[PDB]
Amino acid sequence: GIEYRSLHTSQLTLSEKEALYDLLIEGFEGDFSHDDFAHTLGGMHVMAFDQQKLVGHVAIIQRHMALDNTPISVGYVEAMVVEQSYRRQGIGRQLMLQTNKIIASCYQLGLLSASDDGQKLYHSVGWQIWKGKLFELKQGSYIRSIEEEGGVMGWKADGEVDFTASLYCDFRGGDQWLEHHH
Amino acid sequence: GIEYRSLHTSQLTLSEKEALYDLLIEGFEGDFSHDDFAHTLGGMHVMAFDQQKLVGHVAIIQRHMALDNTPISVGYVEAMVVEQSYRRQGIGRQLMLQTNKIIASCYQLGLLSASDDGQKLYHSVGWQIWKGKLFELKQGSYIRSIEEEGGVMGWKADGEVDFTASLYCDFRGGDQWLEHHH
Numbered sequence: 211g212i213e214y215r216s217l218h219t220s221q222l223t224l225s226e227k228e229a230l231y232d233l234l235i236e237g238f239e240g241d242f243s244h245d246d247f248a249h250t251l252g253g254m255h256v257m258a259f260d261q262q263k264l265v266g267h268v269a270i271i272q273r274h275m276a277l278d279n280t281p282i283s284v285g286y287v288e289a290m291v292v293e294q295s296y297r298r299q300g301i302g303r304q305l306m307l308q309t310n311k312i313i314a315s316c317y318q319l320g321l322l323s324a325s326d327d328g329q330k331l332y333h334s335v336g337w338q339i340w341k342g343k344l345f346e347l348k349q350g351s352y353i354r355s356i357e358e359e360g361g362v363m364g365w366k367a368d369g370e371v372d373f374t375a376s377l378y379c380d381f382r383g384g385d386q387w388l389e390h391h392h
Numbered sequence: 393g394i395e396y397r398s399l400h401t402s403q404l405t406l407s408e409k410e411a412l413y414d415l416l417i418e419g420f421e422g423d424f425s426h427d428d429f430a431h432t433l434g435g436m437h438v439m440a441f442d443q444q445k446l447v448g449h450v451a452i453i454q455r456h457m458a459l460d461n462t463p464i465s466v467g468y469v470e471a472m473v474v475e476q477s478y479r480r481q482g483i484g485r486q487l488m489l490q491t492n493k494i495i496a497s498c499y500q501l502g503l504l505s506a507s508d509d510g511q512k513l514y515h516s517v518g519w520q521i522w523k524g525k526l527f528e529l530k531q532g533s534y535i536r537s538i539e540e541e542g543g544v545m546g547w548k549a550d551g552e553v554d555f556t557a558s559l560y561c562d563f564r565g566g567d568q569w570l571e572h573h574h
């Protein structure tokens with residue numbers, strides 16, 4: 211069947227990294243830059259394989275944030291993709307359940323960014339919309355990230371996380387702006 | 393001989409985590425709290441083993457910082473320890489060389505905190521004192537971390553890192569203060 215392996219970036223072979231880049235480009239329909247690839251590296255990769263062949267991926271990146279004024283360790287989930295011909299068979303769900311187990315063993319909180327349609331998969335494995343305010347650094351000072359509110363979901367490993375509290379994010383750059391649409 | 397394995401926190405067994413806690417407490421001479429242990433978890437552990445037995449460790453934690461106003465991905469090295477009876481045989485050095493290879497495959501910059509005596513080991517494997525200013529968040533705003541300047545060393549994976557530039561750190565809490573000594 212499908213076999214799942216969880217590997218840190220440092221544990222990947224060159225072959226596996228090239229196959230990951232291929233899966234990401236194709237699965238994101240060519241909207242996937244060198245910075246987006248760099249942005250996926252440095253943490254854990256949960257990967258699905260059909261015999262030797264990479265067919266699914268999600269990354270978990272460690273981030274260090276503040277919940278109101280208290281430090282909180284975050285596992286930040288990104289770059290979820292399943293090869294188009296392998297979709298709608300539960301691989302995405304399995305990737306997320308493995309991801310939840312990593313978060314539970316390692317971090318206080320899981321966070322991710324999803325579109326409205328995108329959210330159902332995550333919600334089926336326990337994720338919930340973050341209700342509180344979000345803040346990001348802009349030219350060295352915190353400013354509320356209205357854009358992103360409602361698009362961020364979380365998953366509670368540390369039972370004392372208030373999803374209505376304010377999160378103050380670490381800097382990850384990647385053009386941040388508030389959309390205004392008439 | 394000594395065998396080296398690099399494992400993410402999520403890949404450790406319960407036995408291995410308990411042995412890691414034991415090594416850390418003993419190797420840090422009982423100055424090692426639950427928060428200090430939590431602070432070591434969530435990234436990579438480079439570990440040295442004598443047959444089945446854990447004898448050395450160092451952790452690499454992903455951090456996301458700003459170099460002046462540009463994002464920089466950091467591998468933050470912490471919790472280096474070798475069992476006292478195994479010291480002065482090159483295990484510490486080997487742990488650091490494995491650590492440097494992780495940094496080179498994953499991050500733009502390695503950073504760590506060392507005492508004056510502590511620095512020689514790191515300097516023997518290419519690390520250098522960060523010369524620029526350091527900034528940390530305090531009640532939500534950046535303030536210069538004078539305390540820490542001179543105690544932080546870096547190791548350049550991304551050849552365009554200016555060690556005289558200002559680093560703006562992510563929040564990791566753990567009582568921050570400037571010492572004043574007469």
Ligand SMILES: CC(C)(COP(=O)(O)OP(=O)(O)OC[C@H]1O[C@@H](n2cnc3c(N)ncnc32)[C@H](O)[C@@H]1OP(=O)(O)O)[C@@H](O)C(=O)NCCC(=O)NCCS
Binds near residue numbers: 291296301
């Ligand atoms: C999002 C994505 C990873 C989902 O992967 P997947 O393997 O198809 O996910 P799953 O199969 O677990 O779940 C997908 C859907 O198939 C349905 N499904 C899963 N297994 C099934 C089975 N045996 N029979 C019928 N339906 C099934 C699920 O019900 C889920 O429901 P939905 O139609 O209501 O959305 C995939 O569509 C993808 O790679 N998209 C492009 C990249 C992307 O947008 N990624 C997210 C970035 S945040």
Ligand SMILES: CC(C)(COP(=O)(O)OP(=O)(O)OC[C@H]1O[C@@H](n2cnc3c(N)ncnc32)[C@H](O)[C@@H]1OP(=O)(O)O)[C@@H](O)C(=O)NCCC(=O)NCCS
Binds near residue numbers: 480507
């Ligand atoms: C710091 C520490 C990890 C070093 O581990 P180690 O395995 O002894 O390190 P190494 O053997 O690679 O290097 C240590 C010294 O032994 C010397 N040495 C290494 N191999 C040798 C050999 N075969 N023969 C003689 N000397 C040797 C090295 O020259 C180095 O030089 P130094 O005396 O000038 O400092 C260890 O002392 C320790 O665990 N300390 C307590 C925890 C701590 O303070 N950690 C750092 C937190 S930032």
